[PDB]
Amino acid sequence: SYDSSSIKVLKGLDAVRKRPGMYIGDTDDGTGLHHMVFEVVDNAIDEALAGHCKEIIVTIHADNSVSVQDDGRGIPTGIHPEEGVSAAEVIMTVLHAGGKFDDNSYKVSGGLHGVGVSVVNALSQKLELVIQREGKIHRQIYEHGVPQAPLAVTGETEKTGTMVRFWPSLETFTNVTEFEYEILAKRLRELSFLNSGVSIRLRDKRDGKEDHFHYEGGIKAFVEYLNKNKTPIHPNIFYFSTEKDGIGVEVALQWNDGFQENIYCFTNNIPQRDGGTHLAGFRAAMTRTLNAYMDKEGYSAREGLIAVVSVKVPDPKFSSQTKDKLVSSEVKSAVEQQMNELLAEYLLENPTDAKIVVGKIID
Amino acid sequence: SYDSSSIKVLKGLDAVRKRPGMYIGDTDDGTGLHHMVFEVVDNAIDEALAGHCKEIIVTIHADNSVSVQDDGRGIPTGIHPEEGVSAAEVIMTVLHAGGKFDDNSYKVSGGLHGVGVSVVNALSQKLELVIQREGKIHRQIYEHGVPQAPLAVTGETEKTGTMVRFWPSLETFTNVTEFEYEILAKRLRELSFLNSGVSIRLRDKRDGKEDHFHYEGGIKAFVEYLNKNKTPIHPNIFYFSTEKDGIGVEVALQWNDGFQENIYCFTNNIPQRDGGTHLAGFRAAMTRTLNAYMDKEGYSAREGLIAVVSVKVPDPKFSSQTKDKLVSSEVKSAVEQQMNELLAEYLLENPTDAKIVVGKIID
Numbered sequence: 001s002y003d004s005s006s007i008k009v010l011k012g013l014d015a016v017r018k019r020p021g022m023y024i025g026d027t028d029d030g031t032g033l034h035h036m037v038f039e040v041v042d043n044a045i046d047e048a049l050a051g052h053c054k055e056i057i058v059t060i061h062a063d064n065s066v067s068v069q070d071d072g073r074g075i076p077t078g079i080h081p082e083e084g085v086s087a088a089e090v091i092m093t094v095l096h097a098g099g100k101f102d103d104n105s106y107k108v109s110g111g112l113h114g115v116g117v118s119v120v121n122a123l124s125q126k127l128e129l130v131i132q133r134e135g136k137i138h139r140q141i142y143e144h145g146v147p148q149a150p151l152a153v154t155g156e157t158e159k160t161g162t163m164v165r166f167w168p169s170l171e172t173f174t175n176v177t178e179f180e181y182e183i184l185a186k187r188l189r190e191l192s193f194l195n196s197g198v199s200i201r202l203r204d205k206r207d208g209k210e211d212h213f214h215y216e217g218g219i220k221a222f223v224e225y226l227n228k229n230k231t232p233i234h235p236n237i238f239y240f241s242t243e244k245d246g247i248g249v250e251v252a253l254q255w256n257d258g259f260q261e262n263i264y265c266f267t268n269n270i271p272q273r274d275g276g277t278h279l280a281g282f283r284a285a286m287t288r289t290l291n292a293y294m295d296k297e298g299y300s301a302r303e304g305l306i307a308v309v310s311v312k313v314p315d316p317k318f319s320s321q322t323k324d325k326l327v328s329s330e331v332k333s334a335v336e337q338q339m340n341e342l343l344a345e346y347l348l349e350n351p352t353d354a355k356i357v358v359g360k361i362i363d
Numbered sequence: 364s365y366d367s368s369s370i371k372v373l374k375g376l377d378a379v380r381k382r383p384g385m386y387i388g389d390t391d392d393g394t395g396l397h398h399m400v401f402e403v404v405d406n407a408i409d410e411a412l413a414g415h416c417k418e419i420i421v422t423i424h425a426d427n428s429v430s431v432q433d434d435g436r437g438i439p440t441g442i443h444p445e446e447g448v449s450a451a452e453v454i455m456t457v458l459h460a461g462g463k464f465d466d467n468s469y470k471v472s473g474g475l476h477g478v479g480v481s482v483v484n485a486l487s488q489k490l491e492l493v494i495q496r497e498g499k500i501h502r503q504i505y506e507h508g509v510p511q512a513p514l515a516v517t518g519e520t521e522k523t524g525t526m527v528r529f530w531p532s533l534e535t536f537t538n539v540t541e542f543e544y545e546i547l548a549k550r551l552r553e554l555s556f557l558n559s560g561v562s563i564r565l566r567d568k569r570d571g572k573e574d575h576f577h578y579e580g581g582i583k584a585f586v587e588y589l590n591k592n593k594t595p596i597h598p599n600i601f602y603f604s605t606e607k608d609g610i611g612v613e614v615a616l617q618w619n620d621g622f623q624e625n626i627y628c629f630t631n632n633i634p635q636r637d638g639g640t641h642l643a644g645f646r647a648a649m650t651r652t653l654n655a656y657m658d659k660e661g662y663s664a665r666e667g668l669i670a671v672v673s674v675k676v677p678d679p680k681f682s683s684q685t686k687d688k689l690v691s692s693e694v695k696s697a698v699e700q701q702m703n704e705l706l707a708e709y710l711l712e713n714p715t716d717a718k719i720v721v722g723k724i725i726d
């Protein structure tokens with residue numbers, strides 16, 4: 001009775017719906033449901049990273065669908081030579097298909113695996129796709145990942161970008177099934193801080209609530225925001241942004257009078273809740289530099305610390321599919337070297353701050 | 364320049380080799396490399412869970428390959444009706460293909476996703492497959508996941524089982540590339556404890572070292588082993604195993620005189636480093652039951668605790684592909700109800716133990 005007929009192949013998107021834990025996570029507590037939005041948003045953010053998108057609009061509709069509109073290049077619409085259908089349709093229906101498997105379309109991107117928006121499509125009762133590029137509006141509708149018709153041109157336009165609207169499948173998501181404004185806002189705010197000069201809008205058509213995230217100060221402003229209900233002890237937030245040997249390293253940090261340590265790490269705008277090689281470089285540099293300073297100034301650590309570490313890595317390697325831990329070993333040295341040089345300079349250039357912080361560490 | 368030609372589809376196993384982090388984890392520190400062995404071993408363990416395999420032999424060969432031989436049913440060898448090649452070959456070359464997508468072949472299994480041994484095959488320079496079933500020996504060789512020929516019958520046998528030998532690809536694994544006896548032993552020992560009456564052998568053909576794991580006492584013996592260099596404070600290890608409403612719950616625990624808490628949780632023999640709903644049920648029951656006991660005996664928690672919680676769940680749901688956290692909400696109540704009933708009984712039946720442990724908690 002255990003023979004060839006016992007072996008079942010899950011074709012295309014059927015695997016996502018069978019095993020949503022592997023692709024979207026927890027389908028009952030709300031984190032999976034909101035991750036559906038964040039997969040779409042992070043694809044727009046990647047167009048921003050590539051220097052093509054300047055505005056992202058996220059709308060929660062009154063029917064519990066969510067749309068994300070960007071003004072990037074537009075998902076490619078042409079027939080895919082190998083697959084024989086539009087490239088858009090390939091993207092929406094095929095796992096491990098995308099433009100981030102080399103560095104020709106995006107120098108750096110949060111997307112890595114070629115699955116994210118295809119997972120969204122798989123787990124949506126319906127998904128509407130509208131793409132503007134090459135002077136044309138292209139439209140397609142999917143139901144449970146199945147396209148109604150081939151992607152079709154329906155009008156002319158002088159704009160470029162991609163709009164995805166999706167209605168989450170209640171055959172997949174249970175319990176927490178309505179989108180929460182504040183979960184979406186928290187991440188969208190973080191992304192405005194991490195991406196200066198992208199305008200991000202959030203609109204709730206249920207109650208008319210709206211936000212426009214377009215913070216001026218970048219990850220320096222992020223740190224200020226993170227400290228705003230705490231009591232910063234010194235006024236000059238440490239900040240730098242560099243790019244060397246293909247790796248971007250942007251750091252800000254400020255101490256408050258508390259005793260907790262909050263270090264927020266990101267790789268291509270994707271958070272690492274479990275740290276990794278960027279966090280290891282940051283911690284090594286902090287220690288070495290504060291010690292060197294104390295020694296050279298003639299005295300005899302991360303309590304109260306708020307810090308943001310955002311790296312830009314062409315081909316990052318993580319411990320898993322979740323991207324929770326960065327394992328790219330060359331990033332350790334990239335963070336560490338930049339932050340030993342620049343934090344040293346900061347302590348020299350801001351002696352009142354330096355004295356206050358060192359003060360605290362002693363205690 | 365960002366158009367249909369920019370979109371690349373990774374077919375079959377090419378995706379695993381492109382993005383090994385999503386499938387095998389860290390390819391540089393050794394944890395991925397050893398996970399290759401553990402994917403194969405856990406498939407043999409699943410045959411044991413189904414009541415068909417009684418011996419598993421793991422061999423590290425002198426050429427740095429590893430083989431795993433079991434005496435289970437044998438990977439199915441028949442032509443797969445839909446795919447048109449042997450079911451074995453489907454298993455080895457197709458992601459999301461397997462016999463664990465329903466409960467007909469395995470009532471419970473660590474395997475869930477239909478990928479594990481196909482990932483192994485993808486990331487091996489060579490893989491040799493020998494299957495015995497239906498009175499025949501069937502053989503096939505793969506190179507970087509590509510079969511040399513169709514699976515072929517080469518002899519007769521009266522035995523059943525599956526042997527996989529693989530040589531890991533050094534185009535994938537870097538740095539830690541030689542198998543470590545003790546990493547493999549630690550997990551194989553754990554699995555002997557979790558699976559009484561399976562014989563597990565480990566042999567190193569490099570130095571002649573061998574072990575035979577066949578512990579008598581199950582997860583009670585596991586706890587004894589975990590406490591052996593500590594100082595247990597009471598002699599009777601608490602133990603039960605039940606099955607109710609399709610969920611198996613097996614718990615053992617003993618206190619030592621230290622202050623650390625070590626609770627090891629498993630679902631279908633797969634460890635959850637980040638806990639979940641089984642751990643939550645265990646903790647709730649422990650609290651409630653110890654408090655009820657203290658109250659009824661007229662007094663006025665998990666320090667020093669060593670415990671093993673092993674659940675058997677027909678269709679488990681995890682937070683991710685890594686299976687690090689169990690999110691199946693019905694398991695909380697299954698653990699919790701069994702352990703409130705039985706731990707209460709244990710405290711009544713073992714009053715010297717009960718007095719010693721309660722003693723410690725007070726302090």
Ligand SMILES: Nc1ncnc2c1ncn2[C@@H]1O[C@H](COP(=O)(O)OP(=O)(O)O)[C@@H](O)[C@H]1O
Nearest residue numbers: 043075098099100111112113114115116117162
């Ligand atoms: N908003 C967008 N604008 C332009 N291209 C997009 C957008 N969303 C997705 N794409 C394209 O679709 C491809 C596949 O997306 P997805 O399946 O989410 O996986 P990944 O982002 O990991 O490649 C991307 O790599 C990119 O080429």
Ligand SMILES: Nc1ncnc2c1ncn2[C@@H]1O[C@H](COP(=O)(O)OP(=O)(O)O)[C@@H](O)[C@H]1O
Nearest residue numbers: 406438461462463474475476477478479480525
């Ligand atoms: N040692 C074995 N004996 C019998 N069947 C096996 C064995 N190893 C694998 N199989 C079969 O191959 C299928 C696919 O295995 P795999 O790709 O590791 O994924 P999964 O275990 O998640 O299904 C299993 O579901 C099972 O049907």
Ligand SMILES: [Mg+2]
Nearest residue numbers: 043111116117
């Ligand atoms: Mg993506």
Ligand SMILES: [Mg+2]
Nearest residue numbers: 406474479480
């Ligand atoms: Mg498996």
